[PDB]
Amino acid sequence: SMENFQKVEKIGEGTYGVVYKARNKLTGEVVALKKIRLDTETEGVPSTAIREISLLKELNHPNIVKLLDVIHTENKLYLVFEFLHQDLKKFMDASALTGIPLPLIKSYLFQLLQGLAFCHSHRVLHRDLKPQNLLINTEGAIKLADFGLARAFGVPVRTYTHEVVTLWYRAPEILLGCKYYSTAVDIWSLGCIFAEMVTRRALFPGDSEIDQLFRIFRTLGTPDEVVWPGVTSMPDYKPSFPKWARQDFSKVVPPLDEDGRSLLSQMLHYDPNKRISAKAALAHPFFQDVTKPV
Template identity: 60%
Template sequence: MSLDNYHKLEKIGEGAHNPLLVATDVHPLTCAISSPFPSTLEKSLLKGTYGVVYKAKDINTGGIVALKKIRLEAEDEGVPSTSIREISLLKELSKDDNIVKLLDIVHSEAKLYLVFEFLDMDLKKYMDSLGEKDGLGPDMVKKFSYQLIKGIYFCHGHRILHRDLKPQNLLINKGGDLKIADFGLARAFGIPLRTYTHEVVTLWYRAPEVLLGSRHYSTAIDMWSVGCIVAEMATRQPLFPGDSEIDEIFRIFRVLGTPDEDVWPGVRSLPDYKPTFPQWSPINLGDVVKGLDADGMDLVAQTLVFDPAHRISAKRALRHPYFDTVNLAAA
């Protein structure tokens, strides 16, 4: 399909490399390549990691979609590797109900557009829209937590790490269902685990092994982020809102205690571990994370285990007693 099939409505946001647009889908979504986009840009909606996103309308069906615009650096360089990675991952993951669907790919001149289903709001904006005394409520926290972990389980089952989970990357549709978006940093992982870059995950949701410089990490980094997000949904406050890497590390240590070799075998050998770190004792997590029942607190505690090898997996988390009473119709 060509860009002529979409009419840009407004700019939703802008990422590190490109803007995000919202557009209207005009034809059944295929994969044609064609002429420039005839439209008038109104405003940006969201910020993503690798592109500008626009809201657009499908001229043929009247349906609303999201267009992620990728600028190609140079003709001889072609599509950026980060975009190719995201496209290939999204094609693989689009079958899951809790992952945002990639509907189409359009290549026009020096631009690449990824056409996604349009969702109304991200989790952060959703929480911010609630009154000061209002919260998501225990049923909604449980439902969103389940849908988040279910989507991550699907990713991990397809050997993919998301690596940038945060409330801004979790979208909520009109039916009150949560879907995981923005796979710009995602990586397929193999056995043995690869060496990865240090630049993963927004600071507040970053696992301690990443903060301490480990370049060998696994699905456990996503589960740490899940725990931080579940806690934030319950309290409406970020759990570890550090303003630098060292501040982030110390905020974690002040709550969970400073890890030693007994708690986390191998921690002293991590590149950024310092023997001079202050020695804090753990405090009761329930004093920090309020609004969860005993099962919910146990689930969060199992996601916030220092040793990645003992952190709960998405598969085990879905079977946790906390979800025995999950109501997927909660709204």
């Protein structure tokens, strides 16, 4: 309970609350308290908070951010997470000039795939991977965070919420309204992010759903039944869609070597069913030399 935690400073804000860095006065552990205000006569414990906690409790993995405790009050709900000092995005804006050393990229993407594979092995979809949600510590770890939009999925999956994933990282199958989506939409996201750690700039920075689609088509090609069986029959697909040619993949991310391209290449695959999966992506030669820098 709050008895032993001494707040140290505001470090961020969450959909339903405030997040302070604080200290356990007995163990001395630094933590992240995400407060969640309750009022009664409300709708109660918010469903994103119910999923966050139940799912997060199942995911103990060194690359998944850790929920250490959940303190109750008639009035307040306090989530206590292990604390991490920075997040990948803010680190990227700190790496403006320099840039990100390829070894550091390799390692991070590697770490992330470890955590996403864990999630998927546990029937959890994050549905909001993006640099804001990827926390990093001084020892070189990177870890998935913010299970607010997450959900437990079933096999096979059912039709789930459609308004999902921050736009910039949203996969084509959601933008095209397909009635089913699964783990593949988290890989898309990791893909964009991989690109992003490279050129330090978003890969598909659209401002509407249709803008988002046309930016993907211009980089990777308007898809057709050959490349993606079923597409033309998809709900938000339109025959008036411009048919752009596909770009020599070496131009989408000029600094990438052959493996990097092959990986990115498989993470950005149009057909959800064939997008490489996190588990499998761990095996990619791009990692043959993976290490853990800082």
